[PDB]
Structure 1
Amino acid sequence: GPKFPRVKNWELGSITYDTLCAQSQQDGPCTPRRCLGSLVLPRPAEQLLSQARDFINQYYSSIKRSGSQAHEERLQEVEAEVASTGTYHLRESELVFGAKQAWRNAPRCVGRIQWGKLQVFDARDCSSAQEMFTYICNHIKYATNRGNLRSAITVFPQRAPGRGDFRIWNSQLVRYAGYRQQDGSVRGDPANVEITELCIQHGWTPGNGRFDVLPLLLQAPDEAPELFVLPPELVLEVPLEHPTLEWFAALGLRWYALPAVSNMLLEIGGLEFSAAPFSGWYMSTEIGTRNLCDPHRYNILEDVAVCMDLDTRTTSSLWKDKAAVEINLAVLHSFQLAKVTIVDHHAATVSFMKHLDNEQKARGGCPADWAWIVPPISGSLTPVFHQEMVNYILSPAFRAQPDPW
């Protein structure tokens, strides 16, 4: 056959070959000796120009003018700018294209069928921590849209030679506090202990609830971060109830509507946007399985199993499985009742299969990380489990970056 990886779907028997991976210019962590695919984080003028030329080429292909005069002129303009200043700057429409392409390129995202529909807010004029806050509030308002969620990204100024970065210190725009107790346990979300403590070091008066919304720590170049409280009316939340287990509401659980990642670096043509928060909507398992049932998160499985009167003293009762299903159902039901956009893991994986087919035809492949794409409950009940995937790094890309402190 072809000398490109063969990719099989074992449910349907169908075969594709991934040719897109040939475009990867960046190595992942695997070698012929050992696969490191399951690791969460596996650990310059000529170089900038070559990433920039590549990206400008991607742009001109996307608008079907490769080899055109406007294409050759832009290339020259980019080399001249880099030549005389050591950097360059994107056109508005280049940034929109690059932001969408980073999403389309993200191997860990099951929601990529939506990739073409992203509102890009250009905030490259931002010059202060206070203005970042305004931009972020506008982002949250637009994206939340009273529950009819819309995908969006706001892009703050790029990294610059010798000047400090724009950074949002919080990992997400909405995060529940995690308060360390004298006995060593945690009230609230244990994922957020560090950010919670940093907010308190920077003058935040802490609450003491399990769902206290954190303030934002926003950092403009070469300044200490400044603390900003989100007006509560901007943060849509959904109290959790279950459709037939009437006691579930009494548990006082809730989650926020807007999933907005704020700690990732957006890379386009070698340019680095260190503050570029992006948002979409939730797949129900993120809330109902990971955030609520991880042992190191809210860890509510046993509490729910006891309310359901399950035998929690033995693994073979499948008490964990039964409780998790009911908690996932509660999440779906509560978001539906509240008219807030959410997608269940069956619908989301079906839509990703459609995405894979669309991308096979458009680009000859789709970079995908199987362990991240397969949902954390009911894996083999979803079509993606039976689908082989090829994982590789394309650019434009969203990348993890070190914490600013």
Structure 2
Amino acid sequence: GPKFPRVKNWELGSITYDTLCAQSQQDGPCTPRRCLGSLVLPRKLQTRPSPGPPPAEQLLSQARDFINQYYSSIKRSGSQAHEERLQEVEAEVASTGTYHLRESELVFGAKQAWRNAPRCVGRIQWGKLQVFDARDCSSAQEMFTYICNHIKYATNRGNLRSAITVFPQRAPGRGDFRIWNSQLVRYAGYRQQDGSVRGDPANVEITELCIQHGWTPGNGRFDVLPLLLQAPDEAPELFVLPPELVLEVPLEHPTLEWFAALGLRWYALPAVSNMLLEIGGLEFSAAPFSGWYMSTEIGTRNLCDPHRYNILEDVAVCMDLDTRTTSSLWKDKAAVEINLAVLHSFQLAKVTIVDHHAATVSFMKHLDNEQKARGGCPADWAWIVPPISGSLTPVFHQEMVNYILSPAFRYQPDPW
């Protein structure tokens, strides 16, 4: 039949064809010989620091592509404003090597990038992103102000709002604007004497970086890291977030009274800050974005991963389960309760959060929407299906096609 991937939902037995992938202009990591879909960091999108100005020819075509995308979204493709804008871009690139985006173009692209992210199960909210334009920012100090405003507006006292702050794009020769931290809010990872780690093992390197840069470390298991903001061609400066801006939620269980005694907690705002936002060729090296958590992110990955807090065994001992044999499913039991606790503690503190059931159901709706609007929706199965109760969610039974569309968020090399 149709010459496009045939996708099936085994729960409903329904079929669809992804024609949207035909618009992908960027190759992924797979080949007919072998599939590399499970790789986290496939050396593909990897936006390596490219000092020498981008091939005006390559950039121009990427630019003409985005502009077409923009005028199309406003239903003026082929119009006078469209062709003139197209001329304006080529002109500007002709005499400067690069070009700039209009305000409304940035807003559109930022949303498309989110809309195009294959690993985000929260894309049903893609149309409501609040885009803060910070392309005027000229200092690491100013960056801190923008970030603080971002956190304030986004946190909104527990009633979270999606947002993204876009700092200056990359300029030929000049240094990039960068946020060294992986997230605006992260807990410290202190390497111990015996070799173990106190806090979040994931953040050991950045913790040692803040220290090498003048940060007086604490010694807790949940210390909020300071920010390492870097303006063009300068060494990063250190900024400490005002405690009042960083909303946190103590974790307690709805019925296991002892859970609260564990002293576990998590912050409310998930703000990825080390990803590159690419729009029409232009590269925004610093554009932290944030939404709200899906409970398994905290309860299953962050708190139970072997290489993170790894609290599975402690909670199992507390529930008095048989941690000496796998068939007792002690891991599965403790994981459930830990997840439930996160859901309970966030609801109680009136802080926005969504469970994996509600979340995936909403993504199914998002898929049905995009099927009609764009002919498909790029999705990374391994990242869409929740870390616990996979086949209990409807996404598990939905086949998915993964591919890269632009605008887009890409991983980028650490500045150091």
In structure 2, distance between residues paired with 1:203 and 1:112? 39
Q: CA deviation at 1:48?
A: 0.3
Residue-by-residue CA offset, 1:355-402 (whole Å, 9 max, x unaligned)? 000000000000000000000000000000000000000000000000
Q: CA deviation at 1:8?
A: 0.1
- Could you tell me the TM-score, scaled by structure 2's length? 0.97
Residue-by-residue CA offset, 1:293-316 (whole Å, 9 max, x unaligned)? 001000000000000000000000
Q: Report the equivalent of 1:19.
A: 19
In structure 1, distance between residues paired with 2:217 and 2:378? 42
What is the correspondence of 1:1-400 to structure 2 with a 5 Å cutoff? Answer: 1-42=1-42, 44-400=55-411
Residue-by-residue CA offset, 1:54-76 (whole Å, 9 max, x unaligned)? 00000000000000000000000
Secondary structure, aligned partner of 2:34: coil
Q: CA deviation at 1:338?
A: 0.1
In structure 1, distance between residues paired with 2:181 and 2:3? 44
Q: After TM superposition, what 4+ stretches of structure 1 lie above 4 angstroms from structure 2?
A: none
Q: CA deviation at 1:161?
A: 0.3
In structure 1, distance between residues paired with 2:69 and 2:347? 40
Q: Number of aligned pairs?
A: 404
In structure 2, distance between residues paired with 1:41 and 1:295? 20
In structure 2, distance between residues paired with 1:348 and 1:61? 30
Q: CA deviation at 1:108?
A: 0.4
In structure 2, distance between residues paired with 1:236 and 1:224? 29
Secondary structure, aligned partner of 1:282: coil
In structure 2, distance between residues paired with 1:56 and 1:178? 44
Q: CA deviation at 1:320?
A: 0.1
Q: CA deviation at 1:153?
A: 0.1
Secondary structure, aligned partner of 2:249: strand
Q: CA deviation at 1:165?
A: 0.2
Residue-by-residue CA offset, 1:328-363 (whole Å, 9 max, x unaligned)? 000000000000000000000000000000000000
Q: CA deviation at 1:180?
A: 0.3
In structure 1, distance between residues paired with 2:64 and 2:105? 13
Secondary structure, aligned partner of 1:393: coil
Q: CA deviation at 1:186?
A: 0.3
Q: CA deviation at 1:263?
A: 0.2
In structure 1, distance between residues paired with 2:226 and 2:62? 36
Q: CA deviation at 1:230?
A: 0.1
In structure 2, distance between residues paired with 1:314 and 1:382? 28
In structure 2, distance between residues paired with 1:362 and 1:74? 25
In structure 2, distance between residues paired with 1:305 and 1:333? 19
In structure 1, distance between residues paired with 2:144 and 2:126? 26
Residue-by-residue CA offset, 1:129-165 (whole Å, 9 max, x unaligned)? 0000000000000000000000000000000000000
Secondary structure, aligned partner of 1:343: coil
In structure 1, distance between residues paired with 2:341 and 2:26? 42
Residue-by-residue CA offset, 1:178-219 (whole Å, 9 max, x unaligned)? 000000000000000000000000000000000000000000
Secondary structure, aligned partner of 1:342: coil
Secondary structure, aligned partner of 2:154: helix
Q: CA deviation at 1:127?
A: 0.2
Secondary structure, aligned partner of 1:260: coil
Secondary structure, aligned partner of 1:3: coil
Secondary structure, aligned partner of 1:103: helix
In structure 2, distance between residues paired with 1:156 and 1:175? 21
In structure 2, distance between residues paired with 1:54 and 1:231? 42
Q: CA deviation at 1:265?
A: 0.1
Residue-by-residue CA offset, 1:244-266 (whole Å, 9 max, x unaligned)? 00000000000000000000000
Q: CA deviation at 1:34?
A: 0.1
Q: CA deviation at 1:286?
A: 0.2
Residue-by-residue CA offset, 1:89-140 (whole Å, 9 max, x unaligned)? 0000000000000000000000000000000000000000000000000000
- CA RMSD after TM alignment: 0.2
Q: CA deviation at 1:243?
A: 0.1
Secondary structure, aligned partner of 1:214: coil
Q: Which runs of 5+ in 1 are unaligned?
A: none
In structure 2, distance between residues paired with 1:365 and 1:317? 42
Residue-by-residue CA offset, 1:253-300 (whole Å, 9 max, x unaligned)? 000000000000000000000000000000000000000000100000
Q: CA deviation at 1:242?
A: 0.2
- Could you tell me the TM-score, scaled by structure 1's length? 1.00
In structure 2, distance between residues paired with 1:354 and 1:209? 42
> Identity percentage over the alignment?
100
In structure 1, distance between residues paired with 2:313 and 2:25? 47
Q: CA deviation at 1:318?
A: 0.2
In structure 2, distance between residues paired with 1:147 and 1:49? 43
In structure 2, distance between residues paired with 1:7 and 1:299? 37
Residue-by-residue CA offset, 1:38-60 (whole Å, 9 max, x unaligned)? 00011x10100000000000000
In structure 1, distance between residues paired with 2:56 and 2:224? 43
